[model samples]
Target chain A: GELDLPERNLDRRELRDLVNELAAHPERWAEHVMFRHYASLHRDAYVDVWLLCWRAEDDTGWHDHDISSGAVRVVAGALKECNPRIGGEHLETVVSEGESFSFGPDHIHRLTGAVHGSVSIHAYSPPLWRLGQYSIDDSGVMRRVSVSY
Target chain B: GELDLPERNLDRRELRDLVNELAAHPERWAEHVMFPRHYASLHRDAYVDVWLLCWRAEDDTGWHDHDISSGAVRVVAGALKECNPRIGGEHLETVVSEGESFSFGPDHIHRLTGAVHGSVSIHAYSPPLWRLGQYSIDDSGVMRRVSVSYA
Candidate 1:
């Protein structure tokens, strides 16, 4: 169960492969608001990894990882991600099982589960902190507020 | 996709969580195995990250060490062996099969390879790997840490 392989930072492609690998195993799902459950896969001073589960209607309102860059892969089922564009309709990406996507610290988006619920694994660099949530207010003004994630 | 969460080091319990998390999604494995290939990137923070790796026969990782990061692994399939050389003593060795896990500190030096037909595992490391030190025992019996690429 112990192993020693060379260590180094990972890029988007490598991160994708890693999550795809995690997908090889089945996840145990429980019920909740989004019907999701998560566990830390790995973490240290430089990076953090997590395994997350999601079910129908589970949604994360628009948010951004304050200082961290991250990647995610839908290991099972389907999910949808939407990013609001200034003065325009939102850009949407539907991620199905085995599909993946990556983003930088500046990227902001909202995610929700699709028809059959979903299971996903995520990776974050510098570990996540200072998260920001976005919402559109009365005057049609979009606002972002910070939170300790 | 983006995820917002706090940062911290993961202990053995967290490490085991990852191995179990990996158990839920079985569609990721492929039909063939050759040299070891990384499968996924579970998480990454300022200090560490996780990866899924697969191995096949004849796949050998020469002796090496993480210069400053400690790491742990959980076997998901088949078997793997860890090897460490010692002076005038029995070389340290351990073999682990499915559902088992182990860890090594920053100073630990060792080599790894497939001990059975096929091997699959999850590896986690702190401070992320960068600049590895390969080991070599000279003719004079002096062991040295030589710089090598962590591929």
Candidate 2:
């Protein structure tokens, strides 16, 4: 048998309520990354909300959120920020638990699991786009590659 | 009769070429402030690739990228990056002559325009969204609306 994937007109009010309610309680939503309990889709963009589980340390690729802006909050464990720096320069901003912050199309930053466990949900405006990976050679020239699907 | 606004089919190779090619030649794409050219549609997504042209002295709103990484290059005049301060700092980057360019994706960190010009192309990407603003505030925190649309 085939699976059904019917599209539904999920009202924005309803979607916002669901997200707010879920964020209010972390234990119920922060452990199941694969569960599509929170999502909203439109012809131009979509929003995805799910639990993120952190067991061992994991990391996100160094990326720039092209054209979009968003907020991410740590609902459960701790979510850490690793601000980009020049060679031999240490990072300045770091966040612990019960914290939320935002980034925009111009904000090129990276995220990581500072502690043994951490997870967070991100909310993006206009959604993710052709992201550019930031890499530096020994000479420190910036190179860009598009990761847009 | 209604004008035909057909889209173009550019495979990955074609799209990649178009980007580099236009980025290489700015005079071929630059136009006027009131006259924004929409090139043949090359692909489909939340955002569309239509060649945009801006003539010298043309200026656009102080806006942000449409939540997607996007940009354009000099097909004609001189283009400059008008860095608007968000939380605090303000900076500016500039591109001159044809082939010169600037771009942004989500978090690329910059605003755009042909504030000083000859001609230029405006390329953009967005997953399809409604409304964007010039982002300005008064001393009283009273928000204002500039102009908006879906792309």
Candidate 3:
């Protein structure tokens, strides 16, 4: 039901065309931090899927899926993913454009928009209801923040 | 974590109180909608959740869940909920405050909300990544629309 962007890199015009072509127009924008729309093909209980839009200065803090995998298609923007290493000096980072990229169940990453009004469609396998947020203090200590909404 | 509003008629102050308490806090908003935090909670699966915000002229569509269970909490503004009938043509509606009211699972029914610049939190639970939207549409225009989000 979507163009597999990960196999290749896409430009702004291509991404925009793909997004507009999706038949289901279910859309909602919330918190100025995220906008979401359901993909016509997905069922609510099987796989969680949606299109996302993030405005300027928007960012998701360092976090990871406890046991899920994820895939994304950059429709009209670019995003920087910062992978959290279990124990290492350099954090793995990648720039995802119109292409697609995915993370495994053991993946830990954070996402931020490259441009002010970047947008993309993200998909996750299984489903998410709860998660742990990672926080490190100045005392050279790491902390985990458990949150629910 | 929520107040029991029951079948009471809530006013403006009460709705505002609930909205401010649940979603008004800036710290909680992002973690609520984003998928990463939820993946950690659900573990090895895809899940979806949502929060509703209405503009000045927005109207809440009275409907039921998409074959899944859900919970609602006032996050920023106020809402007017009208009840669905089990009997005659009577519309019995109730107003809930911030952190008030819980609906889901077996007790599915019709409830509509009209929010004025108000925000509310809604969460759904499904197994193995739900994909029920397709089965709903038929040759005719009758469609089953559920207010839901995925992980």
Candidate 4:
């Protein structure tokens, strides 16, 4: 068996290492890109691992992870993340292959497909059950809608 | 965020899937394969963890027990031999090779080493190992168990 690292909660560093280890091997990809494929990799008491396949039209609307913290690693292609910040424009980031990003429960973001198709691996701690989806009313006020994924 | 599976302990099927995922990747082999290379991939709230390691000749772990963690091992490259002396003589040996896997609970005591060539493998355990028992036999033919850091 392999040796252990410092005991800790799920974090971006661990996710990055996991993705790198995954890239070194060949799995974690999907051929069908028209509709995103959220393949279950591993699920345990502490976390859930998912392999997500993306194409040019695939996207996720603004949402929050409810009670879970999440880390994502891009295994192939590129992705655009739009995060809403208080009192300002949305913070946007472009994550490419081998790159990783992490967020706490409070983060709200919309991830959209990029110029090319991509594949990513995501790890969620405490496992995701319900999430909050964002929308705007006629009064221009933002509202939160709870949904399950 | 992704959906969760039924909440429970990891079993053999999931272990097989994890192993298959690792085997689909490429190999990381090198010369002078001494001192196993360990790379930790995930650790979640003391409940579970993942790791990748590479091995070559002269790499052998003496008899040991996982203390509290139940784990699964997947051989991604080459071959690995798992021995449980507690099982005694004829039934003690099991050879795990590329794309193969095996699992053991906390109570299992075993030793693992490369069969002949360089190898790579993946391991997943619950409650991340903090300490374990290293087994040895005293000169008088008595068994000794020593607690050691699991690093």
Q: State every prediction's TM-score relative to the real structure.
A: 0.44, 0.43, 0.37, 0.43
Model 3 / residue A21 / CA error / Å: 10
User: Candidate 4 residues A1-149, lDDT tens each?
Assistant: 12133334466456556655655555433442234767776666556677788878877887666556778888888999886543334567899987887765445578995655588877776567656565554434343454566
The reply for model 4, stretches above 4 Å from the true place, is: A1-9, A27-35, B1-151
iRMSD per prediction, in order: 26.7, 11.3, 22.6, 28.0
lDDT of 3 by residue, B1-151 (tens): 1223324333334434444454545454444343211211212123333343332325554444233322333424354454542222244566654455544332234455654333444332322123221112224322222223333
DockQ of each: 0.01, 0.05, 0.01, 0.01
List, residue by residue over B7-114, the lDDT tens digit for candidate 2.
533333343345556555544333323444223333345443444545446465464433333443334345555553332222344444555544343333345555
Q: Compared with the true structure, what per-residue lDDT tens digits does model 1 show for residues B44-150?
A: 66656666777766767676666556778878788999776443335557798888887765555577875576677777776566546554544534333444445
DockQ for the candidate 4 complex? Answer: 0.01
lDDT of 3 by residue, A43-128 (tens): 24434455566665777786544444556666566777765432333244545555666654444567774565666666555444
Model 3 spans > 4 angstroms off: A1-43, A86-89, A92-96, B1-151
Q: Encode model 4's per-residue lDDT on B37-145: one tens digit a residue.
A: 4444533334555666667667788877665567788887788898765312232568888878887656556788755556777777765666566655544333334
In terms of lDDT, the poorest run of 10 residues in model 2 chain B is B1-10
Evaluate all candidate structures by whole-model CA lDDT and list the values in order.
0.62, 0.45, 0.43, 0.62
